[PDB]
Amino acid sequence: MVYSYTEKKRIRKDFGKRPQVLDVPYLLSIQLDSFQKFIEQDPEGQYGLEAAFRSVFPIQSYSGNSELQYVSYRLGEPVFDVQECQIRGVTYSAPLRVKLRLVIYEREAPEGTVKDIKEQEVYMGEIPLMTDNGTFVINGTERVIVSQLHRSPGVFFDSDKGKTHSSGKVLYNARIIPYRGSWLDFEFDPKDNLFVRIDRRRKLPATIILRALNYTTEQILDLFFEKVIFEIRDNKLQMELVPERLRGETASFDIEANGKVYVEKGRRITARHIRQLEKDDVKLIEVPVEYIAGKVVAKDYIDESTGELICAANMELSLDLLAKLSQSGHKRIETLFTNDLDHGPYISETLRVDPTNDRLSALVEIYRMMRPGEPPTREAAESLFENLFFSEDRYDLSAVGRMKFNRSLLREEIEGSGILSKDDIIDVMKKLIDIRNGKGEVDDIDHLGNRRIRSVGEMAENQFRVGLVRVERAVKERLSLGDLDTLMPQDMINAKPISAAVKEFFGSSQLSQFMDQNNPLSEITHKRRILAAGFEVRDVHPTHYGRVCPIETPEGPNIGLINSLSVYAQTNEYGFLETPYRKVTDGVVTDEIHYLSAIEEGNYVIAQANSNLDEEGHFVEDLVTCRSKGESSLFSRDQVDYMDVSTQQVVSVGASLIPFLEHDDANRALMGANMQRQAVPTLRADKPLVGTGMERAVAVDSGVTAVAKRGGVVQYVDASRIVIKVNEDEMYPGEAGIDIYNLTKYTRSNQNTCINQMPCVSLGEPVERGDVLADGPSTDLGELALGQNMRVAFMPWNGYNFEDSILVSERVVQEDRFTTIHIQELACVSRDTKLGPEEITADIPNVGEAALSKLDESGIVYIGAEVTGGDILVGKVTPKGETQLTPEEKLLRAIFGEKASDVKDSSLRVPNGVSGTVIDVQVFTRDGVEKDKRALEIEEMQLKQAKKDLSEELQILEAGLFSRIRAVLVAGGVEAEKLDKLPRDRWLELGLTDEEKQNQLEQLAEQYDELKHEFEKKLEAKRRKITQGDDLAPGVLKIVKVYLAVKRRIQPGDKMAGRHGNKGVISKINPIEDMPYDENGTPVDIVLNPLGVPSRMNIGQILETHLGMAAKGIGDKINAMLKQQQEVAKLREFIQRAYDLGADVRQKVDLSTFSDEEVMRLAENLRKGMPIATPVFDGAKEAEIKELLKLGDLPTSGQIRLYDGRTGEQFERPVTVGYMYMLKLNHLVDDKMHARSTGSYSLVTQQPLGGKAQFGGQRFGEMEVWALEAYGAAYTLQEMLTVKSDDVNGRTKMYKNIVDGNHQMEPGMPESFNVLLKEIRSLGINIELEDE
Amino acid sequence: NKLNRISRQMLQEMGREPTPEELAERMLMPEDKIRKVLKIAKEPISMETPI
């Protein structure tokens, strides 16, 4: 706070105005929080293993009154720790130990138990564990599980207008999507007949489900329709009239009652007439006997005398039917209230299409729909229908499903049953009809309130759930016949069934993938990623604001199907996406933060991230740009309920790292944030000269760096480890302590890059908690450096920059700055063949002494021996007996007297063209085969190296503890010179006067002895892990893994890009002599083609250049005053000037800093350049940039004169020169490049195939055939698809001619077509080749 | 078949799974034959397996 210790080393000058109210949270939050909820002890149904347990439990047998319940669970210590788990290849996992209680109820109970055996913690499976950095290790490889985005469980009402039937009229459909179980779909049709289908199955008339719920027709009309009361009073047909019923209808007869005619015939009833009837309270009017000719009778009507049905429910009455029910004494007749506009007569017409009658009928017709063709049964239909939506087992909405369900139905309860109830189905139908009636609207799938976010924690729970159901069937099956006290909860519950559910997910699943680690940003941008069809879902939605990044998505087959998480976004309590906001009460902007979900934010009026307020925080302008409901417009001063937290929150970590983003077109911006993840780390971690201010946060939040656990002073600094002596205020009373950081050294990444940590602090320096102790790869002094900035000139240079091509000075490759270190893992397997076992022995037929030189006696290359293409890394030989040679080979051996060995050479040799240094060797051996010499040496080395490390722990630790005892002993009994004389081991005897200090000595004693023994146990375990024979695959006797470190610099063909989306491929590496130089004589590193700038609209790349130039100026200047050794005063003065820069920025600054030791160190770090921070949308402006160029001594234009290093003459016009940050992506040319002359061939069809990593030939496609067909080239095409590939004969007959000097082809027939003939002929088809 | 049976009990009985030589002592024969027998006993993989 108010500046840390590594901040005193270097400070980034920050332009930008808007003060940051909230600072970027942990970027890895989602991944860690989710998994943290899965595995945890939660005393309730909140999501977790506890919840997944409580669902399926207790498990009772079949009627046998034998029940198995669940007590509690625990996670055993991991078999291997994270580092060890990677080397061996097993998964990083913990044993799951769960206590089970087996109760058996006495047969023919009152419920009571004969005996109950409590089986102590039965083990089921080992579940993977998440690393402190949020990754998983499946088989020896760090893998990330991407969060998924799917449709939230609940009810959803859609349209399907347009395309259907092309008559318009739209449609309205509802869909009930449970978290688990079958789908329930309701839909209309062009006839306004409501239909239902379970899942995607056959369409069925909607009402058929209501009957299966035991609802007769009378109650269906009574549910969905209102009642028009008809009275026969005195004689001939009176009627009850609700005065509102006359809206939207024209009088069909004289509407008169109470001796006064309210409406005549042919006069439509408007608001005036309705008012008269409403205000005059006209209950009963006289109607004609013919009006009921269309009215559908509500309930059943029978003849009281004859006991016969006069008319069934849902029947249209007629003038003749009225007669037959009138003489029977019926006063009242209920009919449907039907209006083709307001309340539609839909259900009525749905019943007339219903083939069923009663519940059993519907159940028969329903059971035969799902499982057709088989005879229906009553018990079968009942069981099925109750098991679909009414069974707690086969159906659940869980909490989110029930909540949105109730929420979308306008209910009160936010939580409820996890199955469907008859009330639920009826309500859903009601809502669908209401939308068709015009009151209410349909949802849209793209809204982020209907899009729910899962993540590792939620997904693993489902798989573990699946494991428990497939084990459930087994437990019941055994408890069926079980003998009383013999079996216990072990013989039943297996391991393999449950473990394989979880194992099949993390091992192979589309959501579990290799972490993309070539780059810290790549990691952190992978760990935040989403996954979800036509263009609607791919497109950006208004609800994406602050939740999903609009501009970071892949460009390709799936666009907008990935996105990435926004900066400040958080998973909602229920699992939606919520974003930070500021509550604006009255006219003040309050700094209380409020998280609003997608549906929550909708109604509020939210201000803009960019707005002007001041003092008390009253809006300066009388109206400010805001967005309210799905749209944005100008809003009045005091209306706004909330305001945006920060200017960044719209974008993502990727996009937030692009300086001057506001100035770049979104296409190039996308590509930029897409390409920035590919930047391979460099040899010298540099720093961005132009920046944002996220780079610090990205570096730290990602685990690539090493952060201080507790603050203090550095006791010891080595390139290996770092030991910090903790401050006492931060230190716990017992054990005293020091924090020991073991740094990661050079090692292979997933992408074969180098990940190596370097100490950024110096001996005996104050460090505060949360300070960077050591940089990782591609991080500099706590910031994130994905590349190296360099001097760049925009101008066409003799076409060598032609398209995007980049022309780079030799100075760059000489400085070795863009050099890159690759670590490749090569393997050698000694397998077992029926002919015999393969030997790793160093005796290889037909190799000279120079070849076997680099190998030790055992046959393995020495560690550290530099190798090139073709050198033998591991000698290996496999038995092949009875070679069966030929006459002339036999004479050859006879003349030269060589004994042809019974063993063939399989030895592992360095791939063609790659050259590096051997940094490591591992030897895995089958358990029971004798470890060879070298393998034993390695084991001995690992043993000794292990002992040194552990001893180092104990040595520094013990001193750290005894150094505290020295201090506590001096309080109350101080003897200074006396105490350090006697042996340190004898200190533990001295007590103290009554005080807590006597108890403090006690505390330090206990923990001391603990360490003594903890060290012991740790050493033993390590030793066993070394000596234990590693488990290998079937058939493999031993494996040798060699680790080569190749150092590649840069060469034509490599891909290079800036943060602004400008790609490039280095064309020529030009001498420093030919480089354009300025009057001062300093050449320029890179010459970019300006023509790429206007077409692709990215203007930031120019700004980034300009400000960069300015930045280097402030650097260069300091480099002069430091080389002048002026004094602290002059330096201090000039720096202060820089950090203010003319007005109104948020930076603040010094004279609190110590004027000597702290200031001089800062200037030394600035002399390379002055780091500047351009916030994403708050970033600097031209004027600010031009003023910094004034302080720079450099022109405002940003252009200068340059001279061609060849002719030495000037260049017409000034050219823009500056400093642009540039990344080296890993496409590097010596990977992509392949060439093949004659390689191996596929067996099934003879075709070129790389088996040696000598790549198969290029694929010649159909389109290329057309290309040859358009040219007149017949012979090139024949040779292309016959002799060069598919002709097993023609190829050899050709090769022999090529060396003989005869260019011809004796083509023959491609073997592919020759196979098609037999394949056709394998059928009953006789296919012959005719004539001649 | 005899091996599967032992591997079943021994799966949870041992808490991990019997070592390749564990069922070997349980079984009558020379006990190194586990490797040989286990290999030829495996069913061939469909050459049409999508990868």
Ligand SMILES: CO[C@H]1/C=C/O[C@@]2(C)Oc3c(C)c(O)c4c(O)c(c(/C=N/N5CCN(C)CC5)c(O)c4c3C2=O)NC(=O)/C(C)=C\C=C\[C@H](C)[C@H](O)[C@@H](C)[C@@H](O)[C@@H](C)[C@H](OC(C)=O)[C@@H]1C
């Ligand atoms: C198990 O997952 C696999 C396939 C699932 O199948 C399948 C059908 O379901 C997918 C899911 C669920 C994805 O989320 C996905 C994806 O997110 C993505 C690409 C596109 N990949 N590219 C391919 C290479 N190319 C030169 C560039 C574009 C994909 O094809 C897929 C993909 C599938 O196709 N892209 C990105 O996210 C962006 C823009 C950057 C990616 C980061 C790096 C590159 C990857 O993480 C690398 C390190 C590995 O992780 C992958 C290799 C995974 O493979 C393994 C075994 O790990 C792969 C996703």
